[PDB]
């Protein structure tokens, strides 16, 4: 029909570098590809809003045309934001119908990618995460379920949005007709695996910056369950680092330990591992490191970090006798360290604390001389004079503790940046331990003075 | 696992009360916690959760809360208030001690006790009146107050009998510590000459007070008299704070031993027995491991002042089996005084430790003064002239005379210090043509000894011309007359203090060492039986002039009733027109060194402490 | 004419009473008198308590039990600087003031 | 003197007291140190645990104060001094209510542990903040684990013991 000839004439306009005559030409036909020729002529012309309106009729006439679907929304985004630009990014394809709609899942993944950029550029962070999670679910659900992780939606955020959850094995627990590899083949036609890695990165980042660190950890564990990245040990290490970072920052210290234990055992001497491993095992209730620290110390008897750290475990177990030798042997290697001169001078005070009395003075002066080397190494500080106060409080020597605390109140906080002044400030703890001294001494008024002025917070 | 709860806790507290009462029958009247545990199971079958061991600790965990501890004490008092619930338990002289009767009587007593203390109220039926006035008009209303409920201390009663009594209370103790050598060196007749100045009534009163509180034990030898009694084991229990007396003087003995090495700037060093080839020419004092406990506190304090340096020589083997998975070789150390204090240590707000005098002469005149009212011209004119040759304006002269007039008017009684300060609070400010403050004016009258701080139950000032009954009159050894304030640590002859009694002052430091920050009204009342309470302040006055003790004050808190909010502050006692009465005390950083230097390490008075 | 609200949250704590369930049961009579005086009186199931006001040394922070559909949880509810320390009284029809035996 | 006032004694739900050692200017700042309502409720769920007060809750290396839980019989009494002035004279009337029964009190009695700030001291005595380093506070592995930095390894708790020992320069034969 004439529409074919007029479309050829419409192409003949572009063969002379013209677009605007498509508008009369279409107006002679209508009373689709002709609306697309008209819409894209309007896009080559300045009439971007009329192009979008014409693309509206295209999408109304041909909603399956992915390029029109994208073009309408992207032009609406170009015309403004927020201006209902995410409309006409509806896939309208059904998860039961994937026996054929797996082909349409190519469009769905492409649409979700585009939609994700509109959400991200708008700042609808939760909706952006929803597109990322749905895409990653389509990619990786065959491991999330093996991680016993599933996807749900709820209004708990104030609107119906998606979240990851663990599922109980009583409900759900840890490739027919080649469907999984067909899904893999069609979806890898959109995104190469490095973009699946980029999706992993983007999702983890967005989950972290949304403070949904718990769900990032669930995604990480599911991604570690994804063998086809877990087999790339560089990716695995990077996932482990994210998994550790999330499990630290959500305070799931039990889950954090399971990661940091692996990294340390592979790199027995890097300091910025041991610095983190210590605090994870400090906040976690799990005792499991005690046997682990024996195994690694027997593995690496020279290792200074373990030599002190194994001392911490025995000292925490109350076996001050065997603990001390591991601090002192550490101190032989790094004598100008306040912590090791502290931990030894503190250990002899634990020993002197016990019910036995034998030569107890010799243990105390061996205790307090090593604390003087701590103080001398550390310099005059709130920390330095407090800790000798508490050390002399533990032994009940409160005729000396009282002056170590008063000195620490008269001395201003450790200024260095990174944490706010009232959080470096020990004024509270030392006013409290004085308030315990004063309360125990029957002086409520002086205890009250301290809590009113120093402990107002 | 075990989970205790309010129900079993309450019954256990009753079993604790029953245990406390039945401890008066048999020491450890329970056969084992089983007897309680049976009552627990019999009352609460869920006590199958709980072991007999858990009972033995739970009976000691709960008492950690003062409110629950007070709840125990009040209910125990409400038991002890009525003999009828205990008499048949306590009065039995037969069946006194066997496990079956002890078990049976314990259960029976607790079963009876559960009739007095019960989950539903004894009497929910009572009529109770409409308001406080109606309440007291109808009912006598009574409750258990705390054993600490008291008012502040106050001036004692008006009689010369009270003046005699409040000196005699410690003249007796000035005998009780004397050895036979003192009883010979100041002979029996010479102390009888002293005691016969005081009436038998107040003597019986003072001895009864001492005897009633078990402060006195009968002497064995082969009115009160020196041969009659001595400081009881419990009297020493008053002063025998857990710190053994020897520490402080042993801690000076360490310091004085240390001066044998002189002084040096050598930093501390920590070194291997593996490096015996490296030595500081061995010029350091070796520490006596398991030396007397003063060797421990001396190093602890000298570290804190930054005034000592140490060679801690430790081998490569503190641990004999160190290679094992799972014997302490305690290790030698050597010391030397520093030349100069380490930077920024706890500078003691006091004279340098080397500057001190290391002798008994350091004790203030308070402990050695002799008073002599005849030492100066009787006429006020001499003291007016002394103030006229001082900087005093005539406004200060009449102000001083205005202050003096009140004190001389009371005769043998004295104006208490706080009464005087209120009455002449207008003289505080030194304005209005004054040049002197009230405190300077009264201090001048005291220092020019028109006045004496004769004390009593609280600080009172009296005219020097009439202070006599507040002072002991005695003689030095043929003899010469002397007069002094009576104190337990002063010699009956008045000529001297007793250095062996100053274990009282060593104990006083150990008191404030055990309870640093103790408020004065609790410290002074603690000695309520033993020490005439002003004498507690003079020991505190002493230790502060030695530098061992620091006084501090708070301004008195306004009552917390009726939507008030506490005026909670420290103060520096600036004023009388507004008060600052709550003084409290702290030890100073070096009190053991500052005290020990004063006293020779002679054998302590404490030997009676053996059971 | 004029009316105004003034308030304070006095925490009351009771003593001289053991193995009790009074607070669960006593509501049948529950009365307070002299509340603004120095020694207010509490009548409770016709038990009678007397005491003095005291400052809390710390702030006493009071939380309410709450339930999730069951599991117990807490919510913050109050804080108070001020507290009332109480002792069970004894009565006999006979005068002024509660006698406290030291 | 006015008559006794009848009081609505709710008995509605029990109340739990935390004797917080401080003066609470604003509850939004106090509650984080107890670990919040989530924290104290979890510690109310198991009486073998102890309530831990972190006086410096922004710092991971804050070793906490520990509570002892106790039973008690207690009530929260809201007084309402319904004040008036009336023809004219000022007047006062009372309303009051007892909001609940306080069965339980947490008292802080264990002294604050030893505490060691996140600052290294080089042998030259200069202080270096690891708070810029070890806090992991930016989630993208802010503490890059292989970096050359000081070892900072405080023991999990610097003491097991929060009460003073009976030692007073005292030996015994035992």
Numbering used by the authors:
A (entry chain D): 419 to 449, 456 to 598, 604 to 886
B (entry chain A): 1262 to 1483, 1495 to 1598, 1669 to 1819, 1976 to 2109
C (entry chain F): 14 to 82, 89 to 113, 120 to 127
D (entry chain E): 10 to 96, 103 to 189
Task: Paste lines from the article.
TFIIIC is composed of two subcomplexes, τA and τB, that bind two gene internal DNA motifs: A-box and B-box. τA binds the A-box with low affinity and is required to recruit TFIIIB to the promoter DNA. τB interacts with the B-box with high affinity and, therefore, is essential for target DNA recognition of type 2 genes. hTFIIIC consists of τA subunits TFIIIC35, TFIIIC63, and TFIIIC102 and τB subunits TFIIIC90, TFIIIC110, and TFIIIC220. TFIIIC220 forms an integral part of both τA and τB connecting the two subcomplexes via a ~550–amino acid residue flexible linker.
Our cryo-EM analysis yielded a high-resolution structure of human τA, which, however, remained in the DNA-unbound state in the presence of the tRNA gene. This observation is in agreement with biochemical studies on hTFIIIC, where the TFIIIC2 component interacts exclusively with B-box and is deficient in interacting with A-box. TFIIIC35-TFIIIC63 form a heterodimer that binds the C-terminal TPR domain of TFIIIC102. Unexpectedly, the remaining ~50% of the cryo-EM density belongs to the C-terminal half of the τB subunit TFIIIC220. The C-terminal half of TFIIIC220 forms an integral part of human τA, suggesting that TFIIIC220 links τA and τB with a ~550-residue-long linker between its N and C termini. Whereas the N-terminal WH1 to WH4 and eWH domains either directly or indirectly (WH1) mediate B-box recognition, the C-terminal WH5 to WH8 domains form an integral part of τA and, thereby, serve as a hook that tethers τA and τB. A potential reason why we captured human τA exclusively in the DNA-unbound state could be due to posttranslational modifications that may regulate the affinity of τA to the A-box motif. An alternative explanation is that human τA mainly did not bind the A-box due to the absence of TFIIIB. Once TFIIIC is anchored to the tRNA gene, the τA subcomplex, connected by a ~550–amino acid (aa) flexible linker to τB, will search for the A-box motif, separated from the B-box with a variable distance between 30 and 67 bp, by a fly-casting mechanism.
